[PDB]
Copies of this chain bind each other. A is one copy, B any other.
Amino acid sequence: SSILNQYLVGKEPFYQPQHDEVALFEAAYRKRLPVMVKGPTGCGKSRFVEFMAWRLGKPLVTVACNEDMTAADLVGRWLLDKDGTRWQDGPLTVAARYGAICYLDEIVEARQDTTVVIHPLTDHRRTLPLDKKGELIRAHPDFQLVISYNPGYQSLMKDLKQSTKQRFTGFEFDYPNAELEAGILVQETGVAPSIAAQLVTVAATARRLKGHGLDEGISTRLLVYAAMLMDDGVAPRAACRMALVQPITDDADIRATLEHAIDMTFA
């Protein structure tokens, strides 16, 4: 079968849109414009991309990005076989060859100008240089490049270069408003609505502590964790300590603050 069939999103992933990012991604795709998704960790960027891959009926090749990621990781390599020499394409190369969506997750993790590899794939005529193979690929007309990164979570030297930034269209994601986020919790875990709202208020409290002892507030992912634990019958206070507090802080006082909020919420 096709090497891309394993990258197909089979069952529809649940995604709750916050604003018009679905239709706008479809517009970007119809114009084959590269897409950049920005936001804090755990606000549904990858699940958004994955939902779009489902809706467009396109295979999704996701690459998790490194600090030790060289240009080499993405493109492909020469395998020395008993047969004696065969070439094997990398993820980005497969996507570029057969019109798949390539999703560079946490692109800004990689060293900045290790990431200038994607520039030829964003020119008006999109190409991919496999210079170790000696091949010049013309990118499949249906190929779509998507990148993701958490702004402020990386160095200014590790930040995306302007030359790279200005090759993309962009969406800025943030954690959903209280109602939408509660709805996500309820849909994902089946936890009671009012309980979901309570969890969300705890998250709101931590997120309000951003810049005041926390580098980042509580993500939606951790709320999902807390709800999942509760649904398995874990005591609410324990679940929230375990999922919402211990992961994000080592500071004893911030911990005390969050735990007090939790104990005020769940008596």
Return the contact of A113 from the options B66, B120, B132 (Cβ within 8 A). Answer: B66
Return the contact of A41 from the options B79, B111, B162, B215 (Cβ within 8 A). Answer: B162
Among A6, A20, A117, A168, residue most surrounded by chain B Cβ atoms (within 10 Å) = A168
Given A80-B85, A81-B84, A171-B242, A162 and B216 contact (CB-CB distance below 8 Å): yes
Return the contact of A64 from the options B41, B80, B116, B132 (Cβ within 8 A). Answer: B116
The distance in angstroms between the C-alpha atoms of A124 and B182, with both chains bound, is 19
Return the contact of A105 from the options B41, B46, B119, B218 (Cβ within 8 A). Answer: B119
Return the contact of A163 from the options B62, B81, B151, B153 (Cβ within 8 A). Answer: B153
**Chain B residues, CB < 8 A from A209:** none
Return the contact of A243 from the options B151, B161, B169, B219 (Cβ within 8 A). Answer: B169
Judge if A165 is at the interface, Cβ distance under 8 Å.
Answer: yes
The distance in angstroms between the C-alpha atoms of A165 and B120, with both chains bound, is 25
The distance in angstroms between the C-alpha atoms of A246 and B79, with both chains bound, is 41
Among A113, A136, A238, residue most surrounded by chain B Cβ atoms (within 10 Å) = A113
The distance in angstroms between the C-alpha atoms of A233 and B31, with both chains bound, is 11
What residue of chain B has the Cβ atom nearest to residue A29's Cβ?
A: B232
Complex copy number for this chain: 6
Judge if A178 is at the interface, Cβ distance under 8 Å.
Answer: no
A167 to chain B, nearest CB (A): 7
A-B contact pairs, 8 of them (CB 8 A): A6-B136, A24-B234, A36-B246, A41-B162, A90-B131, A169-B242, A169-B247, A172-B246
Which A residues are closer than 8 A to B by beta carbons?
6-7, 20, 24, 27-28, 30-31, 33, 36, 38, 40-42, 46-47, 62-68, 70-71, 73, 77-85, 88, 90-91, 105-106, 109, 111-114, 116-117, 119-120, 123-124, 129, 131-132, 134, 136, 150-153, 161-163, 165-172, 215-216, 218-219, 221-222, 225, 228-229, 232-234, 238, 242-243, 245-248, 250
